[model samples]
Target chain A: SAPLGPFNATLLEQLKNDYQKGEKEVTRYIELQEKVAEKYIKMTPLSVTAKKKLPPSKDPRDYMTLSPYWWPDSTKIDGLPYIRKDGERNPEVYEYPERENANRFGDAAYCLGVLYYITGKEVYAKACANHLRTWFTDPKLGMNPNMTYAQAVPGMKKMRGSGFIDSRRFSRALGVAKLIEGSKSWTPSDKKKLDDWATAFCYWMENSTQGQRESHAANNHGLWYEAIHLMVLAYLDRTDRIREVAEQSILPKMGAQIADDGSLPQELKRTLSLHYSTFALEALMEANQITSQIGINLWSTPASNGKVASQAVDYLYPFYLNPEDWKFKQIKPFDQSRAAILLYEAGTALGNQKYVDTAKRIGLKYSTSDVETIPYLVLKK
Target chain B: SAPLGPFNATLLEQLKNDYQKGEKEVTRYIELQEKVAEKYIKMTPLSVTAKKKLPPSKDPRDYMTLSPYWWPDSTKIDGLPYIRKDGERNPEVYEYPERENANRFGDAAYCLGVLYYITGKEVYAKACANHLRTWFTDPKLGMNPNMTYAQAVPGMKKMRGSGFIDSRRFSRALGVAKLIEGSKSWTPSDKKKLDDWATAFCYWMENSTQGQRESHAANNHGLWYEAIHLMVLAYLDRTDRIREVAEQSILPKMGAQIADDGSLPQELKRTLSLHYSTFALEALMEANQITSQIGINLWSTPASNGKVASQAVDYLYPFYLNPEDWKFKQIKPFDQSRAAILLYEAGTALGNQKYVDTAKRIGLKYSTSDVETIPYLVLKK
Candidate 1:
């Protein structure tokens, strides 16, 4: 089948070439890459059952992460009900280890799995196998596939909308499974076990209360819910299920959100308008790319708004090129490279030279660091 | 064989699954994908000699692209010596097709090759094979494997600093060779021919005047020359040569450029300081990763300046998190996601939660587009 997402194939081939050569660019990544693998290989594998605090389910395998933004009501005698101050993370959340453990589990496996391929070091792959098995396959350690207790509201309800936002970091770890999938370290049983976990989680996302509520969200949260759900279905390789989301969600539903001028007013409504604009486009844009593998064209496909799906890219381009001209509120400093990445994606597809030219001028030619160089450096074979 | 650079394997796996399942995310990417594939599979495969304009060598086999930024002086009737304009692109460069042809050649082949892998339809692979053969394998149709004629100037010497940038776009297209390396369309003969081309190209980059000049550039050009040189070496899998560049160039030479404060003053000395800083870092960081395969650690290895190579990340962080807090001249809008990627890289290595937290805040949760979402959404599966 076609090669997969987020990373460029050509760019990676260069890195693979460098890895074999012991070249400098790939060397630096390998240096840090080995560090993580080394660190994780020596440590015990992490699991959800290791957390000290109990979940509302009183079952360790039931996944949980605190409502990081919600805090104890100082006004309440028992601090039973938490009060939320948007963006303020509560320190008490550290009591949960699954959130942190999942991140470590995936990173270690990713580094080890990738290293295994680069080098013929069976040790790295073996370590990755151990890591995956403990967190995903061990009866006591493996997490239950649902998140009914996620983002608990303490005194109010069992869960809330903020759960998916925090737990989604696990998505980062899960992708690593595929990197190591071909390795002997990962057995057929491991694949089957992980696949079951993914399918169960996907079913939960589709059937649960949190999944239903997030689908109705008009902003990043909504898109994320749709994205994570799609991620699960992708891993499951369920073509029929995938088609349902494309026709029902992206074409007409998400399409309705696209403004006439090709803008996402909801994303633009934020203080970090440009950042949000780029952020939203990535999800929607990825959706466009993903659908192509199945013969669906979300780009030419009309949305509910009677406009094309990729309209947001054009709307966000001017502000990206000249942020000073953007009248919208932006509380943080910006980087054009982020928008440039978005522009490069759409422009390359549209044959829009102006959009691409602006990206090169603002981000490529003028950038001060190596943040975006690897993609360009591999500019030739 | 380890999975290589530029893409997360899981992300692609998700995309592959979505394609099979006809899901929304993969659907979008596939939509644009087939358009280019369908368009190119039916067209004539581009070759360097197809350019109506011939190279100065009068040998169409020798690669050539015009200096894009240099202009003719109206003061002279002949415009004998083109005057340099730092940022202005001369449209006359379009008259040459090798540069353009090389890009189209690579893009079409890449789309075709990738589509072949995805669909497993012989037609996609066959078209890709024909395209590859026409450009690199066919006797008369194939261009010679040297850029001795790259980026020619009218009134100046045969070539200049900008040549690498223009011709390097081929590098983007060439890396796709590996994606289809195991395919039936790419036979053993095709692999051998492409490897020979890559090796010849590497030799030219090291021995040619333009290549040597670029190595001494002390800026993006210098690093780019270094990067492209390594790319050719990587494709060749020349471990020894790659090691030499690692120790000689990255260790003592590029390392000497790092400031005690963990900054690259050279990159900072620009109107677009942050962009340059980020740009420069990507090259160096990639060097680090590339070298790791050979058991070299550029991160811990001391540079000539008695500083580590990755010090640039820390310096760029504060500015990335709070751009308004930066005093540098930024003539354009910026996005924190660019910086966040750097932070995510370094922080993940250093176990520095603060840096990672900053990445999540400025770029991940707060940013506007879906650009960063795929990496996160595959969290569970």
Candidate 2:
């Protein structure tokens, strides 16, 4: 299961060598990376079964979580229907089952695997393997390869299709699975287990009611659902399914999500206008890169509505460059570095110097955090 | 009587034509009123004589105002000597004579003159003349030409030379005097009164103790004193003094205020580092412009220490383009538009494409309000 299909191996090798050569630029990123698996090593594997307040099936292994943006209505005595407060994260999410657990697993696996790849450290690889096994292979603690109750809302609907967006981080864990494949710490049995889990997850994602609803989402949720699907299939070596999803679901929707002027209308309508717009673009950029591996050029594939991902970037570039240009309501400040990364990737994907120039300008203009430098390692220039 | 010696007649004509054509770009500046003047119109012309706590001045009309950034020491019984609290404005400034009066006069004169020039409106010119008379001509209601006690501390030794910094706004009022020189509303008597006032002011500025001290300041203070001096000299048609000040006072001090790397070390030391740096540059840019008319190009002039005004712009440009690059503490948000205007002027002065491109980029990236647009009108592009 080579889930490293999205990243350039040659570039990753160059980054590793740079780190080994003690390049200050490389060390800058290295110093900021958290010791991924060490903190979570003693923590118990979270399960849906641990949730005291469970949905009907009460399957402990299946994903279950509450919406972070929904809260009780002050006017209602019973708080029957949780009201939406867009961009405001309710504290209830931290209390729910499997939310933080899944995030930790993803972060641990991804960071540990990257560190292992960069340093050629057996301990990092070994720790990454342990996390993967605890979260996937260990029957007593492993999660079910399904997101039936993810992103559930209290006092109203039992679950929402958007709950599956939590699984978007799983794409990184799959990258971890691929990174440690040839390492001594990674057994053939571990690879087989991860492969099987991915295949099962892919099956559930295709056939489940929640998956279908989320897949058709008009914004970032749908983009991520498709992203995870393509990535999982890529890990499973199912080129046929990857092509089907990329060509059918991902390519055509680029224009649908973006207007011809590069505006993300759907995202702009939300309270976190800039966040969702960039979030959607990030997913699209990644999906665009992944699909390119199969010779499907999603970057150039304009949606029937005369829009492409680059147009979305062009629309937001002014606002990214100067926040004062944003006429829309954005409750939180936009992290322009996010747009900076996306522009760099989009520039690479579309072979647009303008996008790349703007990205480099943003890089020079901003002293980006050390962690943000990780992605630029892939750039040739 | 012709006071438009520094500004290009062709550019002023172009502005007039653009306004007459109802160009949206030109009209944008028309919407914002000089409310500063409107609020003070019903009030009497302010003088140091009106202050309950007056500075020791032989001339009652000598401009005197309390320092806005100094506060009374809480530990002292009578708060005998005020302590400096940098960047914190004490409300007691508004209660003093001259500070608001000076600002109102400057704002009204500059805006009204520019408005008259753009629209050819007699009403604007008449109002501007009214303000000029009250502030400069009407003997009983007028201020004296000297700023011996301007920005003086309450408990300090009567006055500090820094008080003359308040007269910086008088530069714009002089520009207004230039704009309305030949207009019907500007009578021959009014013209003579303004000319006499400027000559007297320049005399005081060159000879007075505070003026001499402020003129010798190594930072923005000295730059502003020189700026106001050169502008008033240009209005009074004193080419020799303009050249004398530009060469001996302004041009030679560029490298002393700014490092070769384009950093303004003195401004950077302040809590509002970015603001002071840009403020210093603005005064330099204007001084550079005025000096150019006398065949002394301060823009091309390099300090003996190897620093140029453009270097300061270059040093601060990246930070202006992206705030994250600012490693120094900016107690207030850096106004990028201020940098935008400075860059445009620097680009014009230095013939630097890079500066112009960046200024244009900033202009496009930010949707500047009406007032911000006014400064850009002076730019060719």
Candidate 3:
């Protein structure tokens, strides 16, 4: 919808093609979230304003299901809980105020941005900015320094910093920022420091002792941090060393991490192997997206059948896009259901409606996460 | 397999039938976990001998992928790294340490318990209990009393005692403990204390503010806690109070929470809607399993066909267990691939291989929680 800037022409063209498809999927994602949100909004107790509390529904699962943020005690902990890292589900001990603030504020803003994009409403933008300010510019309300006790376990208190999963929000925050780019109100002074901080965050991700530790992670987290580092750097318009990191550091890691059968080794061992694999694939997608935008095709590996991206897509699609074709391996009772958000987005980015149609056919429509990225599934337009 | 204790004849008969069927499915779950664990065991440079460090793999991700519980520093915050819960998925705070520990310990125990039961080997039981003591009985090494900070988010400073997710681990633990019930080495003192602790925990679940808060949870957590609380109590022979609680508190709440469409409204609002519903159903199954033993038919309500347990099972199974036959709503990247352990147990319990076989057919066989539940797919002679 907007003119391409100074990105390499070839990469820009590919992005245009991908965007054409992605925008449709984004549209769908947006519509889905909005519909769900609308239903939620409608369900809001209009007349009974007594408490404005949820009517004791299990929908939010006591706020455990939807909210990544949790507090067992509203009073004792003083509202301290941990955030999990990218490409991981569990939280680390270390905290990340900027990332965490970005998560809450950015998700809300991104959601509002989606609404604005779909409805073209000024109020949505204003609401979006209000949420954005809660974290970034509002020093009084903004998050503190990075997460504490990063990637620490319950018993392993004061463990190594590498265990910090709380900082996975950076790239996601960057994604949200991408959605809100050029908002007349998105003042440079208001956002530069945060952006610079994120750049430093990326710097550590690439060069710090902790960054080295994470880079060697043979799981989705490795890919996630690598991709997130790249994305955040891209946002800063600093693409020199960052671009190489995506190529040398990230893609090879993906190849090594995912087995020849296209299974993610780390994810396959968990309670929900399928779900973990899907999540890893999403990280791969993020890496691919960033790399592709810079003329670096990370998924260009020719392990036969169109490289890691294509094969990974193929591996996940049959089971994800078409359940009837799924060949069961191992799954337990507690393993949660699976989603093919990655497949849908991949399908859209690569200009394949089969993936898009697969998304629609499954009827997996809902208003959740930052909906703007996958708008087609969310918006009315 | 032996007959379940002298319960109502019908319930006993059902239990035997389910156990027999579950025997077949349990085989699948057991095998999968074993294979996965074996892979992990082999990957270790040597047995974890007092911080013995192995040469880091050129791809540390490979090593980390092998044992996610021990190594989760692939992603980081700023420079601090951390572990993601469940390996880069379902990032949020966690409470209910008892429940999760039970599940983790039980799942491991049950994996071996199944080996021991099928093989009549003492090694499995001994090893399983060793781990248990380390966590439960060993004062110095075991987990502390307070789960006050479990499952805390990154931004949030402390973990919330989210009661809903707590119920997630019960059946597996109970199932494992049952396997070792009459072991020679299983100390009467230890067993008594363990059972007492479980009962007390349940008592807290029922009587304490936390318990009340969680027990009355409107979604999967509620159903799961009811199921687990009931099972744990039943195993401890405190079925009387638990059964009363089930009738007075649980069933009614479940009835209210599960809508006419059989949709668990509370669970469906999260990023993963369908899975939460299934989680609730599993708890319902546990509730049904226990209450039925005492002549409480939780699944008998035909409040609406959609609201029926049969319908709930039917709805979820079609998507998760039999995707080819599944015509229900879903999101993209469908995955009905792993063998479904819970469905198999439910099927065996209900004497409906349609459930068991459906679980098997879709290859939904794996266990994230139960260490010793029935198999989802494969069977041993």
Per-model CA lDDT versus the true structure: 0.64, 0.70, 0.49
Please give, for residues A1-381, the per-residue lDDT of candidate 2 as tens digits: 123454534356677888889998776655544332345435444444566765656666676777889887633433447888887777567666467667667766776777778877787788888878877767877878888777778676544688888886666577557778789989998889888888788888888888888888988888888878777877787888878887788867666887756787888898888888888877777676567767776667776666666777778878878975788867555667566667777776778888888787776221222322444643322
- Residue A321 lDDT, candidate 1, scale 0-100: 74
Cα lDDT of model 1 overall? 0.64
DockQ per candidate, 2 decimals: 0.01, 0.01, 0.03
TM-score for each of the candidates:
0.44, 0.48, 0.43
Q: For model 1, how does the per-residue alpha-carbon lDDT over A113-151 read when each residue is reduced to its tens digit?
A: 556655556788788788877876678888888777777
Among all candidates shown, the one with the greatest TM-score: 2
Off by over 4 Å in 2: A1-3, A6-10, A17-55, A304-306, A364-373, A377-381, B1-381
TM-score of 1: 0.44
- Residue pairs that clash (backbone atoms under 3 angstroms), model 2: A48-A60, A49-A60, A150-A163, A262-A311, A262-A312, B150-B163
Q: Fraction of true inter-chain Cα contacts (below 8 Å) kept per model?
A: 0.00, 0.00, 0.03
TM-score of chain A of each: 0.78, 0.87, 0.64
Write model 1 residue lDDT over B1-381, tens digit each, in one string: 222322233344556666778887566655544553566678798888786677768887777877876787733434568887643456566667676678767667766756665555687878888887888767888878777777788878555555765544556345545656667778998889888887777777677787777777777666656556555665567768778887787666567667788777777776666777787766654455456556665556776557875576777777887777777765444566676655655565556788767766655432112222333332211
Q: What are the per-residue Cα lDDT tens digits for candidate 3 across A17-87? A: 44456666544543445553332222211111112232234121111011222222211212233332232
Ranked by TM-score from best down, the candidates are 2, 1, 3
For model 3, the stretches where C-alpha displacement exceeds 4 angstroms are A1-381, B1-104, B145-147, B153-164, B291-297, B301-307, B317-334, B337-339, B342-357, B364-381
lDDT score at residue B164, model 2, on the 0-100 scale: 79
Quality class of the docking in candidate 3, CAPRI style: incorrect
